[PDB]
Structures are given as structure tokens and as C-alpha cells.
């Protein structure tokens, strides 16, 4: 169908966005980089379905905050939330369960990139 292709493209949109953020870190200078890597993110116990994207949405402000510190962030984050909403819908309710261990921004992005890739692969 073309509804499934819509979902694929939205996931690819989210994935590229997250990948662009990750790639940007490679240029940050040490003082900045060192500080930025001590800012913790919460990781979901489980993220294998679209509804789990809520656990990424919840961590979007913290993502925006740390990114403002290291620089338009408001615009990119808002675009990610728009895609997140389009992908999961607002009808599904879900309560995020986070692991005990928090993660760096690099680990947080890698996990959500893997997530996007994973859903793509199933369709
Ligand atoms: C008790 O809180 C902490 O130990 C540090 C503290 C912190 C704050 C800001 C920074 C920074 C920076 C930075 C980045 C780039 C350039 C210059 C400075 C680093 C560590 N903060 C964090 O771990 C971020 C998380 C705090 C709790 C809630 N939140 C979350 N992921 N839900 C974010």
C-alpha cells in the first residue's frame, strides 16, 4: 500500500534527523564535548513498537536543552516531535518504563537510530 510507504518515509525522516544530530557531535571541541557527554538520558526498557516512540518524545526537552548549550535546536526538536506524533498517533496510550542506567547523548541517539532502522526493516 501507500500508507505503509508513508510510515517508512516518516521513520526515515526521524532516522536522518537523529543521524544528523549524532554526526554534529563529531565536530564539537573537547571542553564542550566533555561536558555534553555527562548529561544523562533515560532509555526505555523496551522499544520495539511504534508506541514506544513516546519514550523518545518524553526525552525531547532534555535533548533540546543540552543541544542549546552546545551550539535552530528548537526547530529541529519540534520537527522530530511532529514526526514522532505522525508515526505513533495520539490515540495510543502508553506508559514508559525506563532502565535504571542512564546513557550519554551518543548512546541515546544510537539506540533511537537502531529503533527506526528496526521498524523500517519490518515493513
Ligand atoms: C543531576 O543532573 C546531572 O548530573 C547532569 C548535569 C549536567 C548539566 C549540564 C551539562 C552540560 C553541558 C554542556 C554541553 C555543551 C556545551 C557546554 C556545556 C552537563 C551535566 N544533568 C543530566 O544528567 C541531564 C538529565 C538530568 C535529569 C533529567 N533529564 C533527562 N534526561 N530526563 C536530563
Report d(CA 48, CA 85) in Å as an integer: 16
Q: Residue 81 in contact with residue 57, Cβ under 8 Å?
A: yes
Report d(CA 67, CA 71) in Å as an integer: 7
Measuring from atom 27 of ligand 1, which residue has the nearest CA? 40
Picking from 11, 38, 31, 49, the residue whose alpha carbon sits closest to that of residue 107 is 38
* Cell (9 digits) for 4: 505503509
* Cell (9 digits) for 51: 508506541
> Which experiment gave this structure?
X-ray
- Does the C-beta of 103 come closer than 6 Å to ligand 1? no
Report d(CA 113, CA 7) in Å as an integer: 15
Number of helical H runs and strand E runs in the chain: 6, 0
CA-to-CA dists, residue 117 to 15, 33, 79, 100, angstroms: 7, 27, 19, 24
> Which residues fall within 8 angstroms of residue 120, CB to CB, at 6 or more apart?
8, 11, 12, 15
Report d(CA 97, CA 47) in Å as an integer: 10
Report d(CA 99, CA 94) in Å as an integer: 16
Report d(CA 117, CA 30) in Å as an integer: 30
41 phi and psi angles, rounded to 5 deg: -115, 145
- Does the C-beta of 33 come closer than 6 Å to ligand 1? no
Give me the CATH code for the 1-123 domain, please.
1.20.1250.10
- Does the C-beta of 39 come closer than 6 Å to ligand 1? yes
Report d(CA 4, CA 10) in Å as an integer: 10
Mutate to test the pocket of ligand 1, among 29, 40, 71 (most ligand atoms within 8 A of CB): 40
Resolution, expressed in angstroms to one decimal: 2.0
* Cell (9 digits) for 48: 520495539
- Does the C-beta of 35 come closer than 6 Å to ligand 1? yes
Amino acid at each position: 500500500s501507500s500508507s505503509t510507504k508513508k510510515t517508512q518515509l516518516q521513520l526515515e525522516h526521524l532516522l536522518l534527523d537523529l543521524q544528523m544530530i549524532l554526526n554534529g557531535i563529531n565536530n564539537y571541541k573537547n571542553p564542550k564535548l566533555t561536558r555534553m557527554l555527562t548529561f544523562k538520558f533515560y532509555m526505555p526498557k523496551k522499544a520495539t513498537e511504534l508506541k514506544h516512540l513516546q519514550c523518545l518524545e518524553e526525552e525531547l526537552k532534555p535533548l533540546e536543552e543540552v543541544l542549546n548549550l552546545a551550539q535552530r535546536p528548537r526547530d529541529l526538536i519540534s520537527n522530530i516531535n511532529v514526526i514522532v506524533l505522525e508515526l505513533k498517533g495520539s490515540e495510543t496510550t502508553f506508559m514508559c518504563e525506563y532502565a535504571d542506567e542512564t546513557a550519554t547523548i551518543v548512546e541515546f541517539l544510537n539506540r533511537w537510530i537502531t529503533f527506526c532502522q528496526s521498524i523500517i526493516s519490518t515493513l
